[PDB]
Write an enzyme that holds these catalytic residues in place. Structure first.
Site, short mmCIF file in Angstrom:
data_model
loop_
_atom_site.label_atom_id
_atom_site.label_comp_id
_atom_site.label_asym_id
_atom_site.label_seq_id
_atom_site.Cartn_x
_atom_site.Cartn_y
_atom_site.Cartn_z
N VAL A 104 1.17 -0.81 0.06
CA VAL A 104 0.12 -0.39 0.14
C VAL A 104 0.72 1.30 0.41
O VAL A 104 1.43 1.19 0.58
CB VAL A 104 -0.59 -0.06 0.61
CG1 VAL A 104 -2.30 -0.44 1.30
CG2 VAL A 104 0.06 -0.01 2.49
N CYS A 105 0.61 2.13 -1.19
CA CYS A 105 1.12 3.42 -1.22
C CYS A 105 1.54 4.26 0.31
O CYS A 105 0.30 4.34 0.79
CB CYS A 105 0.16 4.63 -1.86
SG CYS A 105 -0.94 4.67 -1.47
N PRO A 106 2.65 4.63 0.45
CA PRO A 106 2.67 5.37 2.30
C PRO A 106 2.77 7.02 2.10
O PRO A 106 3.16 7.36 2.34
CB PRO A 106 4.68 5.49 1.91
CG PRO A 106 5.17 5.42 0.90
CD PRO A 106 4.13 4.74 -0.53
#
Lengths: 167, 171, 168, 171, 171, 170, 169, 170, 170, 167
Positions: free
Chosen positions: D49-51
């Site tokens: 998941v994109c940080p």
């Protein structure tokens, strides 16, 4: 630590040994019904000629005559024992042995009989007399420089056999 | 009871008798301060199996000496047992001349401290240990009894340690 | 404290690993009947090119030939492993790996094999040889700066396989 | 083993390596005496998941700098892992340029002292802690893994603490 | 005595007396099985500090009810104190009508179990906790006394846990 | 954890906040050296039962003052709770105007030290203690919750102690 | 080591006592269904007039009317109790007692009720009220110089009996 | 409880009463520094079995004296028991004149320290111990009750120890 | 708990109040340094059996005084009990005039130290103890409750100890 | 370590003794239904004439008249007991003993009755009276230099027998 007590069952042992140039298993229960002399020595291949150890082998007929088993023991291996046995007596070896030579690389037997010199992992010159019922009758422990007498051992064994019968 | 051999920690100190050049000598780890030490163990003197593994470290010791590395053999056998096996010629299955000290560990203390004692037998496993000039343990090797060690691999390791001591990792 | 002893059942392990670009479960009991080589390395993404780790992957067909499984392990996560695997060898990455790369983020495996450098949370360069019955046969532990040899590992594994059958 | 983070007590001291402006640096808590510090934890580098949560704290760091507040990110990943993720473009799920130090806690020591370590995985929960100029812990926030933190809320809490520090409570 | 509140672990069980709708009721955590629960603590009844912070959670309770979330206030004051404060008009500093239960924690057991007891005073810090339908603790918030909580932040957290329960993490 | 109240031993020391004359004050045991002290505990502010028992000690404080005796009330309720109850008229079940300090023990430390804390509820039993001018504890009284204390009996006790201090026994 | 706690079962006791001139066995369990006042005094045969103890005997009919038992207790033996009872009030004795006078030569009862003055092996002037269910309801302990009131004791017991029926006012 | 007698270690120290030359004396082991000591134990005074074993060590003491060796007998009987037995003629089953000290170990301490005490009977086994001039224990001998010891063997041992002390092994 | 009375050891030190010659006095063991002390215990004041046994030690005290021996009586009763019993005529079972101190052991420390406390009852057994000028315990006598002691025997014992102190045995 | 307490069952004992020139076994349970006087003395063969011990033997008829058993005991063996008994009284011996003389080489009895002088392994001059039910009624312990009186012992036993019947 030590489990060797007069009037108490002698500490049980089972180990590998050299007898008649071969590796054998020796148990204390094998000698049930006979007197047993178990004696310890410090080291295979010492510079000092092993006359005291040889004496017990040469004079074993006298013990067999009395229905008495004789066992030698040290913290050296069975391979070390066989090599020293295969060394001629004129070269400081044991030569032919008529008694079993037990290996106690474990230290377990020396510990159970209270004869281990801890800092060196070698047995003191101890000798023990076990009766036909497996009861410890006699304890002898010498410091390293002094050996044992076959005559004294025979005196003790015969006196114990005598008193077993007559009291 | 417990092993004292840990990577990055001072190597377990040892002081015992050894056979070198047919004589009994005293060997301490501190004798080798400023120098790399290879300490290797073997199970038993006078075994029927070819002692070629132990002999290889003696024969090829010039290669270790050229790297300024000390090599020490050790078993739970006595110093008298060592000397007798050394005095047995290699054709008779003996050790012959040993160019390295052969340490006696009848105590079991060294085998215990290096965690190589096979308890039920009172013999050492085929352990090998590399100790740096500061007495710090750098490498642990322990083989089960049937499998021997390589001098080439030991040489590869010690040279890699001497190099990385000065220049970090090789890439 | 360490659970790794010669002649004793090897410390059991179960963890996540990256194999063939996917996340998988790896257990020691999966390798029953086969020789297993488990090796540890300190860190993903070090500036030092991972040639020793790559060597075990490139030369895996030699291990497969001998029916031997090879497992790599560090205290990095599977996400860290995968990213390093997806980094080309040209740029200091692992590239394609032919062996499972185990994640030991909780440190349990390193601890059980006695290879954890406590103050850093990384494994020393340990290698262990486990037999078909799950018995530990060989212990190798290197200080961080020194890698391992695939040739020596093959020598050891073949010697153990041989002595299992013949003696000496 | 035991959390050392208590409200109104000196914040657990930390000292570790971090990535800041593409370089490895040492970060100590004592470096930030006389200044508010926000220390926040995240579970894992190179997550799927994109940080966005972590990036928001970097992107909006000027708002913290204007309040004279230091912001520190931390995970149990290595400094080498951090740098590689920082070198991964945000388009490819990376962190890109970070304006804040990203701390390495491979030890687990910092996560342990702050009581945010998920033991079975060796990863930190999404913890956030506000420490005052005197080193006193003022706020504790810990989220389960799936749910992120708000820069807006963090800003609200910090300036509220700064305000109450000289004016007493607010209403 | 130490905290029993750990993320990902069953939230500390509680059972106490509360004021709800002008009456004394028994409240147990198990009553809320199947629902999200927000449990929040406040220091003291009848303080001269505007209790707007506590009132906000009551006034905006419909927003929590819409999400099927229970909200519980708690302090170390008695039920009798709670009721008297509830019966005090807001314009005279009272709580006024409350739409949520106000728990009494006179024996301090709840504050201790959640690790929010300010020991030297026998009052709770401004702690807030989110517990999921399975009784698992998902969120820990503890504020030092001078700084209040946000209903908006609490709604954000709860909706995020509800969302992530269904879908996992998302971009 | 453990009661520190023993007859013939120094009375457990205390320092806490109190309401006196509508204001928050600090109260210490050492403030009353050279004077007899009647410290009494009650369970709860704002109970439905009229606090006539507590009010009695306030209304009849001149009798204690005339004997140079300090009277202190105490509960586990806060100083804010006390004030609100004091500001509640006696007609509506409040304390009304109090002529004695009402101590706050939200800590529980004072109730624990005097061994009057009811653990499961965090409230004090109806304990009363008489402390002499030297800080030595002379009298222990603890009642279960349903039964109050007597001003007359308290006056009998303190006067008997003041007399015995000077003269000895009967 | 005090076992006396409000709201908890009153420490059980069983000892020898003098009642109506004879040695009897007294047990707390004998009083199930009744209120019991147990009070302690330091010493038999003191130079101070024993009016305080005598008062509880003289006014015992008031306790019996309310179905309440009254027990006196000291660390003295039943033998010195009887001797003191057999001494006329004329000569500083107790005279006829209408209540049991327990002998706590053990110190066990004084220890259990937390009224033992250790250095002296005597009891402080303690008084305890125990309800029909054996629950301790009231603790009173006076330093040696100051006595107790029968009126206050009667007020307490009646208030407990009342609240037991009706609750608070 | 525990034996303190170990080869190569200092011999368990002792101080006790003894009969020597018909008189009561105090014997300390530390008194014998610089000399070899043979310490031997026997079970009981006045046994129906001839004390020929104990007698032999006394009769042949000149052989020990010439080797500069001290010989000490010991049992758990008292000095009064020892003296009465010594004053009993050999023809009546007594000891007669003794040339060696006979220690009294009514304490049981010496027998315990040398691991020769038969617990259930409070008598010593037939133990014999050789202690060198420096107080170091060199030899342990313990016999079950029915079998006696040899003076010849004891002489062999001590001479061998004296010999190797100067020369080493053969 | 534990008896501290051992023959040959310093006698358990004691210090308590006693009734002697119309007053309450303090008595310590150290007051008797340089002379023999007979300390004897009895169970209870005001028993129905005549205290002839205790009275005998008082009546015959001149015989102890002539030998320079102090005699002390002790029970777990208070000094007030002792006094009242002393004030009771011997005709009506009292002690009457006592020529020796009667010690009060109300906290039981003395009976415990001398190992004579019947624990279930808080009373002493009929113990008697002889302590020498140096404070060393020389004799222990403990009788079950029904049987008393003899002044003649006590005199015999103390004179025998005084004698052997100077002479040894016969 | 002492097991001797007034009003409690007397410490049980079982040991060898000399009685009528012979070796016998003595158990406490043998004397159930009778009063027992057990008294201890320090040492056989002391230079001081054993008059106090002899007195209990000489006057045993008085004890038997009251159905009371009398037992002497010391830490000496049964063998030195017999030898001292076989020594005529004119030479400082015990001579003919009409009472059993117990051997306590164990120290067990002396320890159980709390009369063992540890540093010497001898008993103090202790005397104990045990009733028909095995209950200890009287404890007497003298320091070494002072003996016991037969008259006192008889007074005590008779007072106990008397109060058993009359109270």
């Amino acid at each position: 630590m030590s489990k060797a007590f007069i009037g108490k069952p002698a500490p049980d042992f089972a180990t590998k040994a050299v007898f008649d140039g071969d590796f054998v298993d020796v148990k204390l229960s094998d000698y049930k019904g006979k007197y047993v002399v178990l004696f310890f020595y410090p080291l295979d291949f010492t510079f000092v000629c092993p006359t005291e150890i040889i004496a017990f082998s040469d004079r074993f007929p006298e013990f067999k005559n009395l229905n008495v088993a004789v066992l030698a023991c040290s913290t050296d291996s069975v391979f070390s024992h066989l090599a020293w046995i295969n060394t001629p007596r004129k070269h400081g070896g044991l030569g032919d042995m008529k008694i079993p030579v037990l290996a106690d690389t474990n230290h377990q037997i020396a510990k159970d009989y209270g004869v281990l010199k801890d800092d060196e992992g070698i047995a003191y010159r101890g000798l023990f007399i076990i009766d036909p019922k497996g009861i410890l009758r006699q304890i002898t422990i010498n410091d390293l420089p002094v050996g044992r007498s076959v005559d004294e051992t025979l005196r003790l064994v015969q006196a114990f056999q005598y008193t077993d019968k007559h009291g």
